[PDB]
Design a protein around this nucleic acid. Structure first.
Lengths: 233, 205, 124
RNA sequence: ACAGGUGCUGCAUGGCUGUCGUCAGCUCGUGUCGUGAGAUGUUGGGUUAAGUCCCGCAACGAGCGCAACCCUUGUCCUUAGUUACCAGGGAACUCUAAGGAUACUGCCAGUGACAAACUGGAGGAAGGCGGGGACGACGUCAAGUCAUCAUGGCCC
């Protein structure tokens, strides 16, 4: 499962772009055309871009590397959550806090605070707390976990970032370029394709299409994990 | 000047008076006048040693003064030779023979008076105030604490226009009554004028 | 012999309610003789007539402290505390009348720099 | 030798105080933006007594301020009953003075972004900060004090 076919992408609607007014002139090369005033993505370049992309995460999964899944749009809010835990990889789905990576040294405390609130809630430390006060601590934990749910077990910077709708997650791209960690992103035909090492021209607004990309990444990173366990004995 | 003494505002909630005697209103004044006289004398005759807290509780007749220094060996001396000559001296200006005992300071860095005296001594010895102020902050935090605020007021650096420089590190929440804050305001008689030294040591609620 | 403890700004009133004709005796003296204030008389006898039973219970009140209208409020509160003893169905009516609440109002202390609790020494 | 000086300088100072103002503000670390001074955080939608709280948000957090911890009053319980009290010597009650209970938007109905919150209702002595006090952020006014005291310099 390293070569995604062209047929399912067309079935899921990975070719529909955006209006012929919002497009980025740097998006020009791999655009098939403009029907009914909508840009059509050239799938030949998409499927080739995936094949290089899935061949990248596979090498990372065979080297116990850690790739971060980034997506906070409605079309990619939940799907990032389940596919990441299937792959056992960090994710961000609610909002990319400004400075998740460049200011990673400061976020240690917030994650450390979150881990502390989990340990005290396992054995049970609410007996010493009042009715309202325990809920005050409980409400803090859910808010502090809602923002940092996938990166609580990240432990250092990732060496690869998977973003969907590069236009939406512009802050993540700017942070990644600052730190130099490669980013494998999905660009619609309105976004900036620069500062993205492994480009994936695709429709990032369709619920079916987004799930197809993230899952195809998920099986790929899972497949490398299986191959990494063939050297234990 | 708009800040209350952080020891007097805490005298009943989380602190204790360094005096524990009951006297009648006729006799209250002469005890207190005698009580204050002990403090002034003991603060000069025992200046070499670093003394922070002197509790003076006098039972019926006697008086159990309890100094808390960080150098008991030089207050006591060889087999208590120096404490005894002080025993016969404190009684001379007080009533019947009063016993004096010494308490030990495990950490001579969490007491505001001890920290303040060190800064006061350093300013006396022609030390730049910036380094003296910063070091005392470093020592107190490394000695185990939850907050230090040290403020130096006067002609810092021998300048003509006085100014206040203060370096805070930690919490030191003065408005919390259950804070256990050690405070001390000592002075530094330099060659260009008195320099005030104020130290706050927050050591946990 | 239901007992109620009545309190007002500085007066504490103890009442001993008992079924009888309706006589009220305050500090061993009749209510009219003790209270020359018609306001105080009405305030003392208000809860009894509120629920349509003025001449049903004999009262023995012993007041202390406070003033001539603070004692009336203390007696009213104590009479409420005593009426709620025999029957719990009168408590709704007395609460709706506002007699079950002990007035926490007190003379506010004089403040330094001030001439009274709040009066200030006029400036110009 | 000196002591002594309420002699001078508060515009050489320490300590203490007023004041804006018990106003809700004042900053910092890291990150990011800008050549830079700087900005962001701290703004926006609400909301609040409050930079109070929630949600958004290149910010993520923290500190001093707000609030709470303290005193007093408001109801009740417990120990105790003299020099206090007096329902029937009594150990009931008032009182006295130590330790506690209660109050938490806890419950209901609505509005409100599926929120913070707000509006009313029950119970209760007390309802939303129950009433009052203490506590006065960074700083401002070269504010006041050399005559409480201490103190550099000057002077007798």
């Amino acid at each position: 499962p390293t070569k995604i076919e062209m047929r399912d992408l067309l079935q899921a609607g990975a070719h529909f772009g955006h209006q012929t007014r919002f497009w980025n002139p740097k998006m020009g090369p791999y655009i098939f055309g403009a029907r009914n005033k909508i840009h059509i993505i050239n799938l030949e370049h998409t499927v080739k871009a995936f094949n290089e992309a899935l061949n990248y995460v596979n090498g990372l999964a065979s080297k116990k590397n850690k790739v971060l899944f980034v997506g906070t749009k409605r079309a990619a809010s939940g799907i990032i959550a389940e596919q990441a835990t299937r792959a056992g990889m960090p994710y961000v789905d609610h909002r990319w806090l400004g400075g998740m990576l460049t200011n990673w040294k400061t976020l240690r405390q917030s994650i450390n605070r979150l881990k502390e609130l989990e340990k005290q809630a396992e054995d049970g430390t609410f007996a010493k707390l009042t009715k309202r006060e325990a809920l005050e601590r409980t409400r803090d934990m859910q808010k502090l976990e809602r923002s940092l749910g996938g990166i609580k077990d990240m432990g250092g910077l990732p060496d690869a970032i998977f973003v969907v709708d590069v236009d939406h997650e512009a802050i993540a791209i700017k942070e990644a370029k600052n730190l130099g960690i490669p980013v494998i992103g999905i660009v619609d035909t309105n976004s900036n394709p620069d500062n993205v090492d492994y480009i994936i021209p695709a429709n990032d607004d369709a619920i079916r299409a987004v799930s197809l990309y993230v899952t195809a990444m998920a099986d790929a990173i899972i497949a490398g994990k299986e191959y990494a366990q063939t050297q234990a004995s | 000047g708009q800040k209350v003494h952080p020891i007097g505002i805490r005298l009943g909630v989380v602190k204790k008076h360094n005096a524990n005697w009951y006297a009648s209103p006729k006799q209250y004044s002469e005890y207190l006048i005698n009580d204050i006289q002990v403090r002034e004398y003991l603060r000069k005759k025992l200046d070499s040693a670093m003394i922070s807290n002197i509790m003076i509780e006098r039972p019926t007749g006697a008086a159990k003064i309890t100094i808390a220094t960080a150098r008991p060996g030089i207050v006591i001396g060889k087999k208590g030779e120096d404490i005894e000559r002080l025993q016969k001296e404190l009684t001379k200006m007080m009533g019947v023979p009063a016993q004096v005992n010494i308490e030990e300071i495990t950490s001579p860095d969490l007491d505001a008076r001890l920290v303040a005296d060190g800064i006061g001594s350093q300013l006396e010895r022609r030390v730049m105030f910036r380094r003296a102020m910063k070091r005392a902050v470093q020592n107190s935090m490394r000695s185990g604490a939850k907050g230090i605020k040290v403020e130096l007021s006067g002609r810092l650096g021998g300048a003509e226009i006085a100014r206040t420089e203060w370096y805070r590190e930690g919490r030191v929440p003065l408005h919390t009554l259950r804070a256990d804050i050690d405070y001390a305001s000592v002075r530094a008689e330099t060659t260009y004028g008195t320099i005030g030294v104020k130290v706050w040591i927050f050591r946990g609620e | 012999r239901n007992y109620g403890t009545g309190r007002r700004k500085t007066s504490t009133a103890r009442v001993f309610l008992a079924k009888g004709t309706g006589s009220i005796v305050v500090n061993g003296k009749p209510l009219d003789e003790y209270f020359s204030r018609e306001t105080s008389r009405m305030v003392v006898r208000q809860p009894l007539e509120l629920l349509d039973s003025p001449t049903a219970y004999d009262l023995y009140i012993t007041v202390k402290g406070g003033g001539i209208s603070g004692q009336a409020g203390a007696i009213r509160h104590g009479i409420t505390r005593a009426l709620i003893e025999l029957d719990d169905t009168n408590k709704p009516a007395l609460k709706a009348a506002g007699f079950v609440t002990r007035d926490s109002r007190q003379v506010e202390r004089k403040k330094l720099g001030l001439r009274k609790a709040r009066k200030r020494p006029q400036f110009s």
